[PDB]
Design an enzyme around this catalytic site. Structure first.
Site, PDB file in Angstrom:
ATOM      1  N   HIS A  21       0.787   1.539  12.059  1.00 49.84           N
ATOM      2  CA  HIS A  21       1.843   1.311  10.926  1.00 49.84           C
ATOM      3  C   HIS A  21       2.977   1.612  11.575  1.00 49.84           C
ATOM      4  CE1 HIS A  21       1.904  -0.393   6.919  1.00 49.84           C
ATOM      5  NE2 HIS A  21       2.170   0.588   6.388  1.00 49.84           N
ATOM      6  N   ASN A  69       6.910   2.278   1.980  1.00 49.21           N
ATOM      7  CA  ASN A  69       7.047   1.552   0.626  1.00 49.21           C
ATOM      8  C   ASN A  69       8.746   1.501   0.294  1.00 49.21           C
ATOM      9  OD1 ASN A  69       5.431   2.994  -1.911  1.00 49.21           O
ATOM     10  ND2 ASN A  69       7.046   3.669  -1.103  1.00 49.21           N
ATOM     11  N   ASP A  94       4.571  -3.759  12.368  1.00 48.72           N
ATOM     12  CA  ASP A  94       3.009  -3.506  12.561  1.00 48.72           C
ATOM     13  C   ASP A  94       2.484  -4.864  11.885  1.00 48.72           C
ATOM     14  OD1 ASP A  94       3.507  -2.272  10.813  1.00 48.72           O
ATOM     15  OD2 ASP A  94       1.164  -2.356  10.192  1.00 48.72           O
ATOM     16  N   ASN A 115       4.684  -3.847   2.963  1.00 48.17           N
ATOM     17  CA  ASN A 115       5.149  -2.494   1.528  1.00 48.17           C
ATOM     18  C   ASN A 115       6.353  -2.717   2.443  1.00 48.17           C
ATOM     19  OD1 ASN A 115       3.033  -2.381  -0.772  1.00 48.17           O
ATOM     20  ND2 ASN A 115       2.700  -0.771   0.177  1.00 48.17           N
TER      21      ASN A 115
END
Ligand code: CL
Length: 187
Positions: A21, A69, A94, A115
């Site tokens: 991520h 997020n 990513d 997100n």
């Protein structure tokens, strides 16, 4: 329109720095390091910042310290502070839809369940910024995706991602100048 700001998406903290991520963060970290430039902590802008020369252009490198997020909070504050339009922002992230070693360019489009991207669309009021999609591959079923992106790539994947990062760096002058030919996979 040219790129003035590069956002490298990720989660802050040692436990996240090696995860899939965070490959966007790795991209900007490699640019900074290639240029002997450090990041500075900017809590009022919800991020770490570095300004670097890329040949005859300059950019602000941004790592949001918000967690994924709420990345848009950082991107929005920074863009407001430096007076940068959404079209002048590159967001590096990513990408599940392509494999480790692969790297694509895309202007605009929806967040696709990311997100970091959803938060940026929300805070900017538009999705019309440039994206550099760094392949991390896909685990094979949607139900394994969360754990997958919150895990470290294998040794062979990390090597492939590092190579794809090098490839994007080699195309960076073109990327900054909006010359977006699908000419990354021919490298
Ligand atoms: Cl992969």
């Amino acid at each position: 329109p040219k790129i003035k700001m590069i956002i490298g998406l990720g989660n802050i903290g040692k436990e996240y720095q090696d995860t899939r991520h965070n490959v966007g963060e790795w991209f900007i970290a490699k640019i900074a390091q290639d240029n002997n430039q450090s990041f500075s902590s900017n809590p009022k802008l919800n991020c770490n910042l570095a300004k670097v020369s890329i040949d005859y252009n300059n950019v602000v490198l941004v790592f949001p310290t918000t967690y994924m997020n709420n990345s848009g909070l950082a991107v929005s504050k920074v863009a407001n502070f430096y007076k940068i339009a959404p079209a002048e922002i590159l967001v590096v992230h990513d990408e599940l839809d392509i494999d480790s070693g692969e790297i694509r360019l895309k202007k605009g489009g929806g967040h696709g369940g990311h997100n970091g991207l959803r938060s940026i669309n929300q805070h900017l009021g538009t999705n019309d910024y440039l994206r550099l999609r760094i392949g991390i591959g896909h685990p094979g079923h949607k139900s394994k995706v969360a754990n997958y992106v919150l895990s470290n790539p294998s040794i062979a994947q990390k090597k492939d991602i590092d190579s794809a990062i090098d490839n994007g760096i080699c195309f960076l002058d073109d990327i900054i100048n909006y010359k977006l030919e699908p000419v990354m996979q021919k490298l």
